Amino acid sequence: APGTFAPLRALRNLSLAGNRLARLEPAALGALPLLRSLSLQDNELAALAPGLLGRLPALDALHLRGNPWGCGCALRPLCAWLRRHPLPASEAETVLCVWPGRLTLSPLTAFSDAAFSHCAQPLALRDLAVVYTL
Amino acid sequence: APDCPEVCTCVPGGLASCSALSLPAVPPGLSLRLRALLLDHNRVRALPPGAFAGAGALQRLDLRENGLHSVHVRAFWGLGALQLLDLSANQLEAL
């Protein structure tokens, strides 16, 4: 439920491993500026909602092993964090893609921005003029 | 040694046993040096895709009496050296 962790301002460790959480929402976890680490392993988190990462300024540790990560643009807030917060090689070998067939167990740390240049870029001002005037 | 799970029991030669430990999921930190893995009599109801990643050189996998009812298509990716599978005594209704 949203706002459940809202009165818990002084959190440092919040563990949610081995659960059946389909989706984690930024409104559910709320504002946790003092939070330093999170554990979401062995869960069914397909993707993280945009803006979830923005409410955790001091977050430095993240565990994402054993999750059905669908490696598309939906994990753009996630991978950018992993670039700035490099996981250990043992952990990096366990955080993998899951989306099936052609894509499989590809490491998330190996995906760079250029490999997803087709993803939705933020609205510019030149393109904003062109789409109106075309 | 780092190649052995913290909760499981390992012997030289790559043999690891994790049974009778009430594991709710696959133990983390699999290594390439383990050749035979035991996981029976646990409570691993759901098997995440790529759960057995890292132990690509494993040869025998046991999952008997572990409450299995749904297995992902890519859960066994990269287990090309795996030879023995014991999925019996579970509740798998469809593959």
Pairing of strands A37-39, A61-63: parallel
Paired with A15 in beta bridges are: A39
Residues of B in contact with A93 (CB under 8 A): 53-54
- In sequence order, the 6+-apart residues with CB closer than 8 A to the CB of A3 are A27, A28, A30
Q: Search chain B and give the residue with CA nearest A105.
A: B50
- Pair of tokens at residue B47: 């098997």
Resolution of the experimentally solved model in angstroms:
3.5
Beta strand A13-15 with A37-39: parallel, antiparallel or unpaired? parallel
Q: Which of B85, B16, B78, B74 is nearest to B48 (CA)?
A: B74
- Is the CA virtual torsion A16, B91, B21, B72 positive or negative? negative
B50 Cβ under 8 Å from any chain A Cβ: yes
- Reading the block at residue B25, the tokens are 């999921």
Contact A42 B72 (CB under 8 A): no
H-type alpha helices, chain A: 26-29, 76-84, 89-92, 126-133
Q: Which two tokens stand for residue A16?
A: 């949610």
Contact check, Cβ <8 Å, B24/A104: no
Spatial contact of A64 and B53, defined as CB atoms under 8 Å apart:
no
Instruction: Please give the Cα distance from B93 to A74 (Å, whole number).
Output: 32
In one-letter notation, the amino acid at residue B84 is: L
Contacts of A5 (CB under 8 A, 6+ apart): A11, A14, A28, A29, A30, A32
Pairing mode of beta strands B15-17, B9-11: antiparallel
Residues of B in contact with A68 (CB under 8 A): 48-49, 72
For residue A47, count CB atoms less than 10 angstroms from its CB and return exposed for 0-12, middle for 13-18, buried for 19 or more. buried
Residues B38, B20: Cα–Cα separation, whole Å: 10
- Is residue B29 within 8 A of residue B7, CB to CB? The reply is no
Mapping DSSP to helix (H, G, I), strand (E, B) and coil, where does residue A128 land? helix
What secondary structure, in 3-state letters, does B2-65 show?
A: CCCCCCCEEECCCEEECCCCCCCCCCCCCCCCCCEEECCCCCCCEECCCCCCCCCCCCEEECCC
